[PDB]
Design a protein around this ligand. Structure first.
Ligand SMILES: Cc1cn([C@H]2C[C@H](O)[C@@H](COP(=O)(O)OP(=O)(O)OP(=O)(O)O)O2)c(=O)[nH]c1=O
Ligand SMILES: Cc1cn([C@H]2C[C@H](O)[C@@H](COP(=O)(O)OP(=O)(O)OP(=O)(O)O)O2)c(=O)[nH]c1=O
Ligand SMILES: Cc1cn([C@H]2C[C@H](O)[C@@H](COP(=O)(O)OP(=O)(O)OP(=O)(O)O)O2)c(=O)[nH]c1=O
Ligand SMILES: Cc1cn([C@H]2C[C@H](O)[C@@H](COP(=O)(O)OP(=O)(O)OP(=O)(O)O)O2)c(=O)[nH]c1=O
Ligand SMILES: Cc1cn([C@H]2C[C@H](O)[C@@H](COP(=O)(O)OP(=O)(O)O)O2)c(=O)[nH]c1=O
Ligand SMILES: Cc1cn([C@H]2C[C@H](O)[C@@H](COP(=O)(O)OP(=O)(O)O)O2)c(=O)[nH]c1=O
Ligand SMILES: Cc1cn([C@H]2C[C@H](O)[C@@H](COP(=O)(O)OP(=O)(O)O)O2)c(=O)[nH]c1=O
Ligand SMILES: Cc1cn([C@H]2C[C@H](O)[C@@H](COP(=O)(O)OP(=O)(O)O)O2)c(=O)[nH]c1=O
Ligand SMILES: [Mg+2]
Ligand SMILES: [Mg+2]
Ligand SMILES: [Mg+2]
Ligand SMILES: [Mg+2]
Ligand SMILES: [Mg+2]
Ligand SMILES: [Mg+2]
Ligand SMILES: [Mg+2]
Ligand SMILES: [Mg+2]
Lengths: 277, 277, 270, 270
């Protein structure tokens, strides 16, 4: 399976913050936003990950991640020239995907808890498509699964999170789409095709899971508050790519220490040292 | 008086966040970090403001602020090629300053409360230099005024915040400095010259003032939590440059509404509309 | 003017917390809830204060407050045997009030900001009734002033003339409590209900749900950590009002050293 | 095994809050403090539980808890007349314990995470003494296990054999309280003090200062808002343990509808 992170978009619901910075480069406590979906793909066992970015934000991502070799992954880059929709991921990413299955994760999504770590590797064998469900108070704000049926932006309270697994048929499914009334090629339309053909699996996320989207002022700040709370109260750092790479055997002890040393002043590197001790 | 915002630096204490984004473009709840020192200079009555940035982060600042005309100010840009210290502001900014006095504000500083709004215009008449003092629990982390005496990074608990006003002599004072042991031209050395010559005024900030530096994970997140608390509990938005420009008469009603309309999706523009209603 | 704090009720929206403790003895960061409305009256210049409690919660209040001498005030107590409504304040407190005007504050309300401190003394010479207004997103949840049933909710602070006792014994129950709404209207039907909007930047909080209680505690701690302010500290207000001296404040501080509250009193004597 | 909760003490580090209320009746978001240690014992399989309170705070506890029938347990009470130390638990509770092993939990402690739920039943067949370890940045502030006086602090959860009564009546005061430290050592001098480190990812909280209380409340609400978990809800544990039925849980829910706590119980019956 190949991985793609959608890390473009305009981020209008964060203006004026996102007039100066990609949403995916915003801090969520102790790390950039893009670390969270990155580590989700890593935990699923995916090493060849393509980032889709805007042309203007790309240099920041390169500065942060480079080719991913320090995290034991192969990060590549594609450019999305206009924010024309999520389903463009499969068109832009077609050459990256090749003949393989694909995992798409949205750049503003955080997945934490039971069933959202290394157990996600079970999806590499996907045939058809596989998406998820999570209860929310304001479903009209989300894509909604009825339990059967899907609808963008009301009749189930289950939002569909931004993590999707597909077989190789997704590329041609995406290529056939037209822009919606709001001028975007829509992931819900991709999901509908699978649903209509009896080839869409859905699972509700496990009890005790946190799913977050950081695209509003309050949701960004709630996310950062959560991550800190985990550290201060449970002693846990979450979505640390160096640690994930280390535990998967993609980087060794010496590489981990070289990372720690570079990150000593903020405190982040001290965590990496503790992993060894 | 002319204004300069120090908006470069490496931001090492925020790594790996600041490997991807300038510290000055980070969110503090509902706006970018750079809005806070920007509005401090605006409230002091300063319209000609030069931003000093790194070469690599400059495009983000341009995208966000442009030439400042939409906020009724003249924003200009200078490039600092290496993060060689705060006191370089006066060398880099010498042509901007010309014959005038100058206000320097640090890009990571937030000033809120009594005495930190439009009353700051009293400093435009500065002769000599003028700095401030604020009680902190861990003074060894800061520049410290003894009450008399100054020291970078212990014997008063009063930190010197990142807001400085100088007469035109500062340029030549700065040009004469050498790099410290840590490889930076030091603002505390500028302040020392004024102090030694009997030309440094110091005021403790007023009771009820908040001074924040956002350069660690915890201080960034504490700042954002504070700003939201002000809104949710007291109904106050703070450091909104459009509002400051409007109240000073640098933008009119029509310009304010044009700003509001551009910022409708995040909620920020709704505040600007309410100002009119 | 005399003062009354409604410190009874059931507190049902905080069950099961308030099956063990009065809402008005709950902590809001560094002090009990009752300290907030108490300091509001104190800052309005009021020194003779009656607290209305339930029978079963009264001993807690006595242990915390005693007769108030230590805060330079006269705290009296009255019992409300059933939680039959807010307007019963003026029946229960009728003798406490006597000939004077009265200030009523609700036990679960926090008032903070411009015009909610020592400026409140101006309401002492009130004739008729004065209440307040605070813009809210959901006026249907509150009492609403324009009329009385706008986005303007009526907070739990009220100033009245001596007439108020009469009106209150007058009232009957509701669809059931003796309602403060009905008092205010009866004043408005005489056209002597004055309203003021709370100033820009004020915080008005009600601590009667899990989230509102916790939001309030967070707010108070934020004020300390970020602006170095401790708020509604009655010892401090007493000492600023001239009601207790430098030395009385020192003795308060010694009793409170272990929590850190006492250290803040010591700093007042720089 | 039998259980004891130390729910007395003065709570000096929370003055003036705890001049009006016991520390153990303070709210931690959506429930009283006492619910947390109570549910810890309940999850250890313990159903006969004695709460030790001060004389003056006891009525609050009775109103909240009664005899525990409604939570499928047997809650008894004992009075501690002066706050003379934690080891007095085993003197006061000596008859409650009788022939059995005992679980002691501190009233102001919250235990949350892996190995602090129904796994705790394994300590019922304890021989000797078992205590726990939690890494802290400032071990000087705590009791410290390696020996006993490392960065490993001893939380307020303890499992002992029937011997514990003997040792406890044995002890004398300290420089002054009857100390739990001294009990544990006396077991260690026999080499039968077992220690386990709390698992990665556990939260151990003590709510005895302004900041720690408020940090704990924030933590509990964060778990609900972000992971949809309500924690240490005794009704839920009773119903999962088989100690009360679908219908008993419904009746609990009706008494608690206004606060929202009751709605969570209804959702358990999906
Ligand atoms: C629309 C679009 C979004 N994205 C990213 C941004 C988010 O991480 C994710 C989901 O989109 P959204 O969360 O909608 O992000 P957005 O950039 O569209 O923001 P807003 O709607 O507030 O204007 O996909 C792209 O990479 N390309 C795109 O064309
Ligand atoms: C050192 C330096 C800082 N700055 C800015 C960044 C901050 O807003 C402000 C004060 O500096 P600091 O707060 O020290 O910021 P920094 O970038 O040096 O971060 P760190 O010390 O953690 O590595 O000045 C410059 O513009 N140019 C510089 O050469
Ligand atoms: C109804 C009533 C309230 N009060 C107090 C409690 C509050 O501080 C204030 C306003 O009442 P409420 O905020 O409504 O408090 P409550 O005790 O009625 O709780 P709930 O409504 O959640 O069941 O007045 C009394 O003293 N006596 C009473 O009869
Ligand atoms: C000392 C003592 C404490 N306790 C309870 C209170 C706590 O839940 C627990 C541990 O005690 P502490 O946490 O020390 O609580 P405290 O009441 O002694 O408060 P402070 O030390 O701030 O004055 O034991 C008793 O029941 N009886 C006692 O004699
Ligand atoms: C292994 C690991 C997991 N996690 C996170 C991912 C998940 O949100 C959560 C649980 O991970 P894991 O224990 O792998 O869960 P599961 O086996 O149920 O998939 O912990 C990290 O943040 N860092 C790590 O190094
Ligand atoms: C006028 C104004 C002030 N402020 C802030 C700046 C200060 O932190 C605080 C007080 O401002 P101000 O009332 O101007 O204070 P002072 O006259 O004492 O200088 O409010 C804004 O955030 N936005 C505004 O539009
Ligand atoms: C004097 C004082 C005021 N305050 C609070 C009361 C108000 O909420 C806020 C402003 O008080 P104050 O300065 O007395 O305001 P005003 O003159 O506008 O009435 O500060 C305290 O909390 N403690 C104090 O000792
Ligand atoms: C079963 C249950 C557990 N918990 C808590 C107790 C623990 O802190 C955490 C884990 O409980 P549990 O799943 O019983 O863990 P273990 O088998 O590791 O002992 O969840 C509740 O809060 N409520 C409940 O109903
Ligand atoms: Mg979008
Ligand atoms: Mg999104
Ligand atoms: Mg620096
Ligand atoms: Mg700084
Ligand atoms: Mg009520
Ligand atoms: Mg109320
Ligand atoms: Mg103690
Ligand atoms: Mg304790």
């Amino acid at each position: 399976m190949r991985g793609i992170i959608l890390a473009g978009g305009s981020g209008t619901r964060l203006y004026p913050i996102t007039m100066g910075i990609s949403k995916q480069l915003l801090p969520v406590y102790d790390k950039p936003m893009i670390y969270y979906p990155l580590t989700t793909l890593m935990m699923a066992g995916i090493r060849d990950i393509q980032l889709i970015t805007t042309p203007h934000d790309a240099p920041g991502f390169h500065r942060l991640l480079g080719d991913g070799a320090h995290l034991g992954v192969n990060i590549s880059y594609a450019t999305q020239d206009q924010p024309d929709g999520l389903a463009q991921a499969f068109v832009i990413g077609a050459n990256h995907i090749g003949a393989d299955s694909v995992a798409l994760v949205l750049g503003d999504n955080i997945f934490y808890g039971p069933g959202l770590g290394t157990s996600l590797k079970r999806f590499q064998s996907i045939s058809g498509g596989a998406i998820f469900a999570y209860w929310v108070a304001n479903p009209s704000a989300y894509g909604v699964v009825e339990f059967l049926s899907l609808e963008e932006k009301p009749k189930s309270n289950y939002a569909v999170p931004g993590l999707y697994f597909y077989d190789n048929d997704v590329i041609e499914i995406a290529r056939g789409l037209k822009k919606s009334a709001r001028g975007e090629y829509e992931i819900t339309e991709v999901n509908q095709v699978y649903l209509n053909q009896g080839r869409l699996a859905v699972e509700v996320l496990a009890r005790g899971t946190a799913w977050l989207d950081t695209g509003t002022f309050d949701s960004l700040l709630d996310a950062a508050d959560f991550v800190r709370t985990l550290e201060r109260r449970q002693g846990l750092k979450v979505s640390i790519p160096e640690e994930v790479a280390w535990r998967m055997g993609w980087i060794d002890d010496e590489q981990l220490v070289q990372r720690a040393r570079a990150l000593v002043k903020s405190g982040y590197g001290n965590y990496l040292l503790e992993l060894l001790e």
